[PDB]
Amino acid sequence: TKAGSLTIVGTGIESIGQMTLQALSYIEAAAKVFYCVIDPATEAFILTKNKNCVDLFQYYDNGKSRLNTYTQMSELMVREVRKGLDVVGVFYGHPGVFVNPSHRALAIAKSEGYRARMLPGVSAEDCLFADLCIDPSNPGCLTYEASDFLIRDRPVSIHSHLVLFQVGCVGIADFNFTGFDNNKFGVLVDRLEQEYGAEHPVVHYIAAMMPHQDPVTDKYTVAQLREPEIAKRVGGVSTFYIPPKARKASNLDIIRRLELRIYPANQWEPDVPEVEPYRPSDQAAIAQLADHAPPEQYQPLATSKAMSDVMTKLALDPKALADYKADHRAFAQSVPDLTPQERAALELGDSWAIRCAMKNMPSSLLDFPWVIVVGV
Amino acid sequence: TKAGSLTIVGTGIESIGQMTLQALSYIEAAAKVFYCVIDPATEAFILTKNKNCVDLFQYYDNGKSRLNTYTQMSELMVREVRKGLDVVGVFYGHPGVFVNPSHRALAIAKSEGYRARMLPGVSAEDCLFADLCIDPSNPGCLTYEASDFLIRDRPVSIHSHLVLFQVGCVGIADFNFTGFDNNKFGVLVDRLEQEYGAEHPVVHYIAAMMPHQDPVTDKYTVAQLREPEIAKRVGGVSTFYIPPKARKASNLDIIRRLELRIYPANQWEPDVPEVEPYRPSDQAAIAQLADHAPPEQYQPLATSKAMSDVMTKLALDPKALADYKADHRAFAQSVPDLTPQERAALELGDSWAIRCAMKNMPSSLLDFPWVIVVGV
Ligand SMILES: Nc1ncnc2c1ncn2[C@@H]1O[C@H](C[C@@H](N)CC[C@H](N)C(=O)O)[C@@H](O)[C@H]1O
Ligand SMILES: Nc1ncnc2c1ncn2[C@@H]1O[C@H](C[C@@H](N)CC[C@H](N)C(=O)O)[C@@H](O)[C@H]1O
């Protein structure tokens, strides 16, 4: 192994709260931290968690090519891992969703034979689903960088979700601290008008970045986007959501090969029918709650404090994880108050072992996770 | 206002660590918690954080329609909010990404005039980007439910990312505790063979669910998926990633209207060229680091412990947030050790105010966030 490592983590979109527990812990454990966040509470929070932090935001500048900024961000990180330190990069939202420097820095680090990992985080698209009450599954989701969408004239699906990032800097390769002059926005408004028509809805989406703020979820027509006062509101943290125009009919060849509207309807879709919550199926399913008992093959949790504790520290304590990863058996034996089954399950590391150790597994089942929460 | 509320939060995919700080805090604050998670460490962790929890997983059953399960899950939650309690639903990953019961339960609750919110979380798609080292921006991302993809014969873009959820239960509307017999998987393998050809790569992706485990990132050909031993490995937590076959050429009409390969290349793309990290642009940008000083319009953090504290509790303490949301001024005045500017910025709640209170704003700038981290 070569000394030094790079881990890139996210903070989520909304200030502090949308940081994951493993992001925070890796930040605490890092030798050097490099961060690029928008809001200052998040920044100040980060600075309390590690002493050796560097704000990457200072490598932006007026008129300066973002590509140069990204090279610089990524070089600054890889330099400290060549020195043998464990360095953590931090980017708002999800650190790999519309982010050049993370992918760049990890790819460089792995080519030189350093351990490199990205930990996922809550993206602005994630926030979009939550705030606009839509699900990517229904009826599919297409996601593009607004400029890339235009330059490679990427195809659109009228019967699916369309999400467009960086609508506030169409064609702009550089930066400005007072914001962009998004003067080529009308080119995008032309493209959407072509594909969706002038009265198709467009949702201007900006997720709250502070806990007390409401998101922006404003609905305009495509034509409205050309109005100067409306386009003015589109900025650097603007995302567009373009709902489907219609529902696509089901294929009859396929339904037969497989031998075969869910509430609620997508409210942003223009001509949605009202969908009923309590149809007969729903009525019947609900009546069954009265006498409902857990199926035979259901596995109730049956664990101990010692076991839940050790499984928590493995997830929250990167040091504990490193010891366990180095030797399952030695680690297992040294953790106190474990039953022989708990201690055995840690020794294997097996998902099955750990489920059997932590759950009251029924005989039927004994002789593999299955939790599907969407149906089409 | 009507008493009672519903908040749906996520736990992320990897056990405990991928839960966000605001998810955890709402779980702690809730009157009643209903959860649907895969792994038992996450479950046990949740049970330590609130006393009144109900496992929703017991409303699945062999042969039982998932739609009935989802109606039941959602009804159980809305029932407790009709009783006037503040109830939190918990679903693994992102609670609104391929999840019927969350959207269903919130839509019912809002139609009856109860406060209803979804908080986003780390999806399996989020984990995919991180583990497979890809970025949705480059070169766009299409995401479908595998059965929906077939039934509505949804169009594919050969020049973009394709992500397919629920590849392990093609056409299966029901549940089984010992896993699905995914016997109509060959229908999907036919569709992919049609659109991509028999030697196009397909990545079988399963994110580690436990901190010590490695993800599955196995690359098969489309033809290989028909081999019984290979299709056997596809399960309930399987996702497919289908890379682009080629790069789409740039539109010349559009580049002119806008008056106009980034390292690293997508390693899963079949015929990728090798991309250079240190081209001249990169060389030059890096040399500028030696004499680099923060631009004039850069705003260094300049805050106080009292201010960072209060901004942290607003994000981590839903009670503190509720008081602040009820009256900015009263709340601001009652928090100790705030400077007049800090205390004034809280009073307004304004993003600008709070940035000015927490950062040393340069004169130039004084007279609006802009943090774009991808370039095309
Ligand atoms: N608060 C927000 N609301 C909506 N979209 C946002 C927000 N912040 C960032 N974005 C989107 O993300 C783009 C900036 C990206 N370079 C970074 C995205 C970030 N990594 C994420 O996880 O979402 C912006 O142009 C927006 O399209
Ligand atoms: N560990 C995992 N690795 C890869 N994909 C997964 C994993 N767990 C769940 N999934 C995907 O999610 C589907 C189940 C969905 N109903 C729930 C998705 C979940 N809400 C999320 O945020 O990803 C599975 O069929 C997979 O396609």
Q: Identify the H or E element spanning A189.
A: helix A185-196
Residue with token string 């560097």: A54
Resolution of the experimentally solved model in angstroms:
2.1
Q: Which of B309, B375, B298, B301 is nearest to A39 (CA)?
A: B301
Q: Is there a contact between A65 and A169 (Cβ–Cβ < 8 Å)? A: no
CA-nearest residue, atom 1 of ligand 1: A207
β-partners of residue A116 are A6
Compute the distance between CA of residue A311 and CA of residue B16 in angstroms, rounded to an integer.
9
Bridge partners, B239 (sequence order)? B165, B205
The finding on whether B206 has its CB within 6 A of some atom of ligand 2 is yes
Q: Answer for the pair B368, A179: CB distance below 8 angstroms, yes or no.
A: yes
**CA geometry: angle B297, B280, B256, nearest 5 deg:** 75
Handedness of CA A204, A173, B270, B267 (dihedral sign): negative
Residue B113 contacts by C-beta under 8 Å, 6 or more apart in sequence?
Answer: B2
The answer to whether the beta carbons of residues B53 and A351 sit under 8 Å apart is no
Domains in chain A, start-ordered, CATH in brackets?
5-121 (3.40.1010.10), 123-292 (3.30.950.10), 295-376 (no CATH)
Among candidates A61, A40, A56, A91, which has minimal Cα distance to B301? A40
Other CB atoms closer than 10 Å to residue B152's CB: what's the count?
21
Please judge whether B370 and A176 are an interchain contact, meaning their C-beta atoms are less than 8 angstroms apart: yes
Q: Give φ, ψ of B220 to 5 degrees.
A: -120, 160
Long-range pairs of B304-307 with CB within 8 A, sequence gap ≥ 24: B304/B337, B304/B338, B304/B339, B304/B342, B305/B337, B306/B335, B306/B336, B306/B337, B306/B338, B306/B342, B307/A44, B307/B338, B307/B339, B307/B342, B307/B357, B307/B358
Tokens at A161, concatenated: 């979700």
Angle at B6 between CA A376 and CA B12, to 5 degrees: 60
Residue of A158, A272, A161, A253 whose CA lies nearest to B151: A253
DSSP class of residue A20 equals: B
Residue A77's Cα: distance from chain center in Å? 23
- Specify whether the CB–CB gap between A257 and B184 falls below 8 A: yes
Instruction: Show contacts of B346-351: CB within 8 Å, 24+ apart.
Output: B346/B310, B349/A210, B349/A212, B349/A213, B351/A39, B351/A209, B351/A210, B351/A213
Dihedral Cα B119, B124, B125, B130, nearest 10 deg: 100
CB of A13 closer than 8 Å to CB of A92: yes
> If DSSP codes are grouped into helix, strand and coil, which group holds residue A15?
coil
Mutate: best of A79, A158, A370, partner B, most B CBs <10 A = A370
Distance, in Å, from the CA atom of A278 to the CA atom of B306, rounded to the nearest integer, reads 50
Taking the C-alpha atoms of residue B329 and residue B163, their distance in angstroms, rounded to an integer, is 48
Compute, in angstroms, the gap from residue B183 CA to the centroid of ligand 1: 40
**Strand arrangement, sheet containing B5-10:** B53-55, B32-36, B86-91, B5-10, B115-118
- SS3 state of residue A118: strand
Tokens linked to A215: 């998101």
Taking an 8 Å cut-off on Cβ atoms, the answer to whether B211 and A284 are in contact is: no
CA distance B227 to B20: 40
**Residues preceding gaps in chain A (C to N > 2.5 Å):** 260, 367
8 Å CB contact between A92 and A37: yes
Closest of A108, A263, A77 to residue B75, by C-alpha: A263
Dihedral pair phi/psi, residue B167, rounded to 5°: -75, -15
Pairwise CA distance, residues A322 & B242, whole Å: 33
Q: State if residue B290 touches ligand 1 by the CB under 6 angstroms criterion.
A: no
Active-site annotation holds for A263 = no
The residue whose C-alpha atom lies closest to atom 17 belonging to ligand 1 is A98
Structure tokens at A274: 């009202």
What is the strand order of the sheet A5-10 is part of? A53-55, A32-36, A86-91, A5-10, A115-118
Chain-centroid distance, C-alpha B244: 23
Amino acid at B25: S
B27's tokens: 């779980």
CA distance B51 to B272: 53
B68 neighbors B46 (Cβ within 8 angstroms)? no
Query: How far is it, in rounded angstroms, from Cα B55 to Cα B364?
Result: 56
CA distance linking residue B177 with residue B179, whole number of Å = 5
Helices marked H in A96-169 — which ranges?
100-111, 124-132, 146-151
- Between CA B27 and CA B88 the distance in angstroms is 6
Q: Which ligand is nearest to the CA of B126?
A: 2
Please list the residues that pair with A20 across neighbouring strands.
B20
- Mapped to the 3 state alphabet, what secondary structure does chain B carry? CCCCEEEEEECECCCCCCCEHHHHHHHHHCCEEEEECCCHHHHHHHHHHCCCEEEHHHHCCECCEHHHHHHHHHHHHHHHHHCCCEEEEEECECCCCCEHHHHHHHHHHHHCCCEEEECCCCCHHHHHHHHHCCECCECCEEEEEHHHHHHCCCCCCCCCEEEEECHHHCCCCEECCCCCCCCCHHHHHHHHHHHHCCCCEEEEEECCCCCCCCCEEEEEECHHHHCHHHHCCCCCCCEEEECCCCCCCCCHHHHHHCCCCCCCCCCCCCCCCCCCCCCHHHHHHHHCCCCCCCCCCCCCECCCHHHHHHHHHHHHCHHHHHHHHHCHHHHHHHCCCCCHHHHHHHHHCCHHHHHHHHECCCCCCCCCCCCCECCC
Q: Report chain B's C-alpha Rg in angstroms.
A: 25
Supply A188's token pair: 């995008």
Residue B132 in contact with residue B241, Cβ under 8 Å? yes
Residue B314 · residue B349 · CB < 8 Å: no
Q: What are phi and psi of A93, to 5 degrees?
A: 65, -135
CA B230 to ligand 2 center in whole angstroms: 19
Cα–Cα distance measured from residue B56 to residue B105, given in angstroms and rounded to the nearest whole number: 13
Would you call A208 helix, strand, or coil by DSSP?
coil
Q: Is residue A307 a contact partner of residue A358, using CB atoms and an 8 Å limit?
A: yes
Is the minimum CB–CB distance between A59 and chain B shorter than 8 Å? yes
Which technique? X-ray
Residues of B in contact with A59 (CB under 8 A): 292
- H/E stretch holding A196 reads helix A185-196
- The contacts of residue B258 (CB under 8 Å, 6+ apart) are A147, A150, A151, A170, A171, A184, A187
For residue A251, give the nearest of B22, B151, B294 by CB distance: B151
Q: What's the CA gap between A264 and A267, in Å, rounded?
A: 8
Which of these, A181, A15, A6, A150, lies nearest to A77 by C-alpha position? Answer: A6
Rounded distance, CA B110 to CA B6, Å?
A: 9
Tokens 């918690």 label which residue?
B33
Residues B179 and B199: beta-carbon distance below 8 Å: no
Cβ of residue A68 closer than 8 Å to a chain B Cβ: yes
Cross-chain residue pair B374–A166, CB shorter than 8 Å: yes
Concatenating the DSSP letter of every residue in A221-233 gives: ETGGGGSHHHHTT
Query: Which residues neighbour B103 within 8 Å (Cβ) at sequence distance 6 or greater?
Result: A133, A135, A264, B96, B118
Note the maximum CA span of chain B. 70
Cα separation of B135 and B156, whole Å? Answer: 18
Residues 6+ apart with CB under 8 A from A150: A170, A171, A187, A188, A191, B251, B254, B258
CA-CA distances (angstroms) from residue B374 to A172, B135, B289, B312? 11, 10, 20, 28
CB count within 10 Å of CB B209 equals 22
Q: How far is the CA of B341 from the centre of ligand 1 (A)?
A: 29
Task: Enumerate the β-bridge partners of residue A218.
Answer: A204
**How big is the CA angle at A175 (ends A171 and A181), to the nearest 5 degrees?**
60
Q: How far is CA A136 from the centre of its chain?
A: 13
d(CA A299, CA B99): 22
Q: Note whether B95 and B206 are within 8 A (CB).
A: no
Query: Strand B161-165 and strand B239-242: pairing?
Result: antiparallel
